[PDB]
Amino acid sequence: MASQTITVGPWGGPGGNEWDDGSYTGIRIIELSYKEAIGSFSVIYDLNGEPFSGSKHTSKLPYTNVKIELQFPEEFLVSVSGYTAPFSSLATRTPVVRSLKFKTNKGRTFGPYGEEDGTYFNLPIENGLVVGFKGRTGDLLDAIGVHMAL
Amino acid sequence: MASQTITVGPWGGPGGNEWDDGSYTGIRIIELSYKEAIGSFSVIYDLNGEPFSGSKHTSKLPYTNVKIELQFPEEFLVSVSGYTAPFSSLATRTPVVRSLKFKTNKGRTFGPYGEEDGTYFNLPIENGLVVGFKGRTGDLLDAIGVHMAL
Amino acid sequence: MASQTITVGPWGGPGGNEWDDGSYTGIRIIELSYKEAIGSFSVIYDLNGEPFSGSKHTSKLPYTNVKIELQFPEEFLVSVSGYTAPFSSLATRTPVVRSLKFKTNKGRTFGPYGEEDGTYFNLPIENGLVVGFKGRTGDLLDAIGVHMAL
Amino acid sequence: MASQTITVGPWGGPGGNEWDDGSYTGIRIIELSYKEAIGSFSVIYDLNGEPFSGSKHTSKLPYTNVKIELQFPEEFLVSVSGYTAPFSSLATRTPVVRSLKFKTNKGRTFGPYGEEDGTYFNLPIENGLVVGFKGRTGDLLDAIGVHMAL
Ligand SMILES: OC[C@H]1O[C@H](O)[C@@H](O)[C@@H](O)[C@@H]1O
Ligand SMILES: OC[C@H]1O[C@H](O)[C@@H](O)[C@@H](O)[C@@H]1O
Ligand SMILES: OC[C@H]1O[C@H](O)[C@@H](O)[C@@H](O)[C@@H]1O
Ligand SMILES: OC[C@H]1O[C@H](O)[C@@H](O)[C@@H](O)[C@@H]1O
């Protein structure tokens, strides 16, 4: 196939429908919505020094919207963490992403957003960069994973 | 300025002495000891098709020794997981690696070894290989981290 | 700072103005113009399975246009080669790219385009993929280099 | 399969017997022998901060031996270049490695060794590191290629 990157995760459940943004050169902006779990999730990547908009992974729920704006390129993620559990408001009870938190190399923290409820996942990055996301979304964020590169 | 890989981790605490095995072409044998926590941890890497013995990180503790023999190259790790916590019996209450578990692409599970107490960590690898480990060792395994390559 | 790739070259001289398309998932189309030397050079990359248009590095000179359409992703480049040297009136001081030739994994050759004069350059790729180009262009393609991944 | 690197080449002919040292962390020492072509060729690699000897690819011919010692890790190769052509004093008139030259980031040039006859090859490295060699040896060095990593 084409060029490719190291992929970790997914954390979360087998619900909703798969999506993969693919890889890019870094991250500029993450946009998510949240209440008791994570709803929407959408990313403005850097591609070779300019913004590139990933597909929107919108949840239909009326959740609070946040926009995490990184000082790209000198600021970048060193950690992604959160929790996974079901959220009872569904017909199926499969685990979903209840919370996300992000930390950066400058010591900014974004989140937690959502409810720190369930099982903990934590991706600390000692060397390397986050360069794309993938997940599964239905009414909300069922699962999340990350692509990495040097 | 020597060649680098993606490194994730570490998971555990600031105790003991740093070690870094660096990177190789894959994993052949993992060797560890356990009881209440992980003591010893050593690895036989693959280096360009032949075994390469990593440095030993051995604990003096009279622990149970286990040898994890992967059917290299067809079988490789797809998950590293475990638990970190203080171990009350150290002259310090700093967190160490209480448990480890390993899963492979053939569906085998090795562990849990040690005791599942404290904060869970989990690295599921969807695409990528483990090519090295780094860590910290005092009397026990204080921290572990993993290098990944395509 | 941002994601990086293996970069080889440049081949050619220090004239014209520098450009770098950066890196992508692979190559779909190369468009160039030629006569005595290479003029125009532009690329349609694959970005995560969709085409992405590289910046245009156009020559005004009335040269022959060629479009090289690979059957991506099954078909890819396995060799970039060419010749560099000064050219007559337009590039008297410094070498420019006089010719380019490309080989693919399916045994297609595209070119030589231009004239085979001066100093030979040859990049046979045994493993890895071309994921981007860089260069310098004035009236002509003064230089070219390649980013590679995998 | 297991971990891989980008590999460019080969330069030279199809004669002799193939060898492939694989990949490591970097380069400490190149040893070669030369007269009107390249004879012997062997490398002491860096592996995670200690030397690792590659297999000797020695020529029995009465040539001049040369040890290229880099100031590892701060000094590394940025260029491998040379010439290939058949060599009169041989039975098969396939091309062999006639000359090699090596440049470093420190500004040091080692070579040219042998004789600059036949077809030029030239790998300038703008980003990335040489982390192994592969080749072919009979009574002389028939071909050479390079593995590269970030
Ligand atoms: O997004 C959570 C939930 O949303 C909908 O109910 C469906 O798409 C489920 O599969 C999914 O698990
Ligand atoms: O390894 C567990 C423990 O061993 C010793 O007590 C010391 O090296 C500590 O720093 C360390 O935490
Ligand atoms: O591109 C060929 C030639 O075109 C112009 O003359 C300038 O932009 C030069 O610097 C360059 O070398
Ligand atoms: O290496 C030079 C030359 O030496 C030997 O004669 C053989 O292995 C040839 O195939 C090879 O071309």
Author numbering:
A (entry chain C), B (entry chain D), C (entry chain A), D (entry chain B): 1 to 150
Q: What is the paper's account of this structure, in its own sentences?
A:
The FTP structure showed a β-prism I fold, which is found in Jacalin, Artocarpin and other lectins giving a high structural similarity; except for a few loop areas around residues Leu90, Glu36 and Lys106, some of which are flexible and adopt different conformations, even in the same protein.
FTP–mannose crystals were twinned by merohedry with a twinning fraction of 22.4%. Both ligand structures showed clear electron density for their respective sugars in the carbohydrate-binding sites of all the four molecules in their asymmetric units, but did not present relevant structural differences when compared with Apo-FTP protein. The crystal structures of FTP–glucose and FTP–mannose complexes also show this feature: HBs occur between Gly16, Leu90, Gly138, Asp139, Leu140, Asp142 and O3, O4, O5, O6 of the carbohydrates, but they vary slightly both in number and strength from subunit to subunit. In the FTP–mannose structure, the sugar ring is in the energetically favourable boat conformation. By studying crystals of the FTP–mannose complex, a water molecule was found between mannose and Asp139 consistent with their lower interaction. In case of FTP–mannose, HBs were detected between Leu90 (C=O) and mannose (H–O1), an interaction not observed in FTP–glucose. Therefore, mannose is better surrounded in the carbohydrate-binding site and is also stabilized by indirect interaction with Asp139 through water molecules, which helps to stabilize the sugar in the binding site. This local structuring is more stable in the case of mannose than glucose indicating higher affinity of FTP for mannose than glucose.
